Design a binder for this molecule. Structure first.
Ligand SMILES: CC1(C)CC(=O)c2c(C(F)(F)F)n[nH]c2C1
Length: 208
């Protein structure tokens, strides 16, 4: 298990998301589904010139899996997935500029729900989650697990759990007072409101 410090800007963003009073937390789901859609767009496009990129799975979709026993909501996609370099360096580098702009916009009267316009919507996960675990598998790289409970650091390890084929699973370990996001009725409401035109099947799993 390797431990890394967030860039200062991202640590600042995470603290803002965690500490700001903002009741409209439900937008986290729209943001993560949007991320998934983008990742699915990417593998679909790449597969047009290299069909073998789908050897790791032809189906392009999104699953939403609530688990009341673990108090987790998992967003699974079969998108392009992320390399180790993506997890540690690439995405954080691109996120630095978007974070700065988002910060500036907020100071100018924007609100947290506009986070996606700055490309850092993933971090809206911390509106509802005390810890986020990301399991990801890109073609030609290993399956990794990224994890952070904020506090300025994240970890990355090679993942030994069930192999995924290709894609990303975002596991939201929900805050004690945010369990409404495990309810079927609530998730359906949010998907209908904010994600009705996503171009991939979204399956909301039901609890046993
Ligand atoms: C575990 C991540 C790599 C962290 C991160 O920084 C990020 C972003 C961001 F960079 F766009 F914010 N999008 N998706 C992710 C997942």
């Amino acid at each position: 298990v390797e431990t890394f410090a967030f860039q200062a800007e991202i640590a600042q963003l995470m603290s803002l998301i965690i500490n700001t009073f903002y009741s409209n937390k439900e937008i986290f789901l729209r943001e993560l589904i949007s991320n998934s859609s983008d990742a699915l767009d990417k593998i679909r496009y790449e597969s047009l010139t290299d069909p073998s990129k789908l050897d790791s799975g032809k189906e392009l979709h999104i699953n939403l899996i609530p688990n009341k026993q673990d108090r987790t909501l998992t967003i699974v996609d079969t998108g392009i997935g992320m390399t180790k370099a993506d997890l540690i360096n690439n995405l954080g580098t691109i996120a630095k500029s978007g974070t700065k702009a988002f910060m500036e916009a907020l100071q100018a009267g924007a609100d947290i729900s506009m986070i996606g316009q700055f490309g850092v919507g993933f971090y809206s996960a911390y509106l509802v989650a005390e810890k986020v675990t990301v399991i990801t598998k890109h073609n030609d790289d290993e399956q990794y697990a990224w994890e952070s409970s904020a506090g300025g650091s994240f970890t990355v390890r090679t993942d030994t759990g069930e192999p995924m084929g290709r894609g990303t699973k975002v596991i939201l370990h929900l805050k004690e007072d945010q369990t409404e996001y495990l309810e079927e009725r609530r998730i359906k409401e949010i998907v209908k409101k904010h994600s009705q035109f996503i171009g991939y099947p979204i399956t909301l799993f039901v609890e046993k």
